[PDB]
Amino acid sequence: GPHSLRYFYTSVSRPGRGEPRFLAVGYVDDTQFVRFDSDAPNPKAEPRAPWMQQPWVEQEDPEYFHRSTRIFKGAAQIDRGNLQTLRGYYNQSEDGSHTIQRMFGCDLGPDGRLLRGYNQYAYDGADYIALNEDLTSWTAADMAAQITKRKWEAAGDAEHYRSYLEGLCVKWLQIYLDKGKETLQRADPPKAHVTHHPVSAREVTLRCWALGFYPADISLTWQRDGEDQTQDMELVETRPAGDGTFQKWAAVGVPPGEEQRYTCHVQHEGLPEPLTLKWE
């Protein structure tokens, strides 16, 4: 896929427990590189990737964390303001806690220029308003969200956001891809094997494992007699290993003796060709 820069903002109100907590994280692809927490004693943008603590920042952009800190504090204040007005739009009491989330950033195209921009919001975990891919128009999910859409159309906020995408967003994504090249411009293929777990006289579990892959996107399936078995099998949600790689497995329950009917199929960007393998 294309490289992506994404920020995720979460704010939660806490009635009778003071101000909303604001949390920010930034990702290049599936690698986190920064954080901000309004509840930290002295909240600032902190690095969350080794390549964001290399000599280059201090040697060439020493105010990098100060700028992000300043922008994050601003966002915290905007989101406090957003939770107040949303309570109004939806006629909800001061007493219940609510959540506002924002995802935004840019996909980098081969032209070294913007491929796609995102700017979208949820309230209490449901679509509220999104910027459409054309980057000039808005999708509002309900009556409340049309209030914001009219507000933002009238102020021309779309045009403002485009300016960020085509400017800072792609420029900084390219800076991160360069300075974190070893980590980010890489595709660790999955290593796959099959394991064998008796269940009963009528069932043996075949579990196909994919380990140590980056990025997270993968295709992992069983065929019986070359017929896809997604419809029968247990497929776990892709999970982090905790070292910057991902894990997955797919299990089928099979009649004992029928093991050689079943083939596991692995597809990942790091693989020269898809993998096919079987129990031992």
Partner: peptide, 9 residues
């Protein structure tokens, strides 16, 4: 580098 919305909801 992030951005903040020039306006609230």
């Amino acid at each position: 580098e992030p951005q903040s919305a020039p306006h609230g909801v």
